[PDB]
Amino acid sequence: HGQDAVCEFIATPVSTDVNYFRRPCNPRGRAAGGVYAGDKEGDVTALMY
Amino acid sequence: YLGRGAPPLLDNAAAVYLRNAVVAGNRLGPAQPVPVFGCAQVPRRAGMD
Amino acid sequence: WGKDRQVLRLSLEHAIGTVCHPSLMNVDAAVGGLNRDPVEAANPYGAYV
């Protein structure tokens, strides 16, 4: 059919809501990205952690 | 708790207990203890989505 | 429904910040003003000890 795309696995806990997955979401669980930040030096890591 | 001008309860061992029970872990409560005269402020969130 | 087709949960544990603040027992703005017009007397069976 073509080249085989490589699946993955990330150990996430059981009782999270499935409603986080019925939408376009981030696999990390928390919203990442430098687009979301503000005007400060350390916002990009502040979004992450 | 952002407002000011309500009579707090008597037990100062218990009045601080509620303020550390609602503001601690909240999107809205103050970071600095409230200014006694002016206006409290909302903590600067890392990102706006 | 939210903005981006969300299933947002809103429950009683979000209603802590309006009830736990001790202004729910601010009473004397009521008792000090309801006794302005002289009111009659009902049966004093439950109001006397």
Q: Cα dist. B32→A23, A48, B29, B46, B47 in Å?
A: 37, 24, 9, 17, 20
CA distance B31 to B14: 20
Q: Does B47 touch chain A (CB under 8 A)?
A: yes
CA distance A3 to C41: 90
Record: contact B22-C17, CB cut-off 8 A: yes
Chain B adjacent subunits, 3+ CB pairs under 8 A = A, C
- Which residues, in sequence order, are CB contacts of C2 under 8 Å at separation 6+? C8
Among residues C21, C14, C11, C13, the alpha carbon closest in space to that of B18 is found at C21
**How many Cβ atoms from other residues are within 10 Å of residue A47's Cβ?**
20
Rg (C-alpha) for chain C, rounded Å, is 21
Q: What is the resolution of this structure in A?
A: 4.2
| CA distance, residue A1 to nearest chain C CA (Å) | 35
Method of determination? Answer: cryo-EM
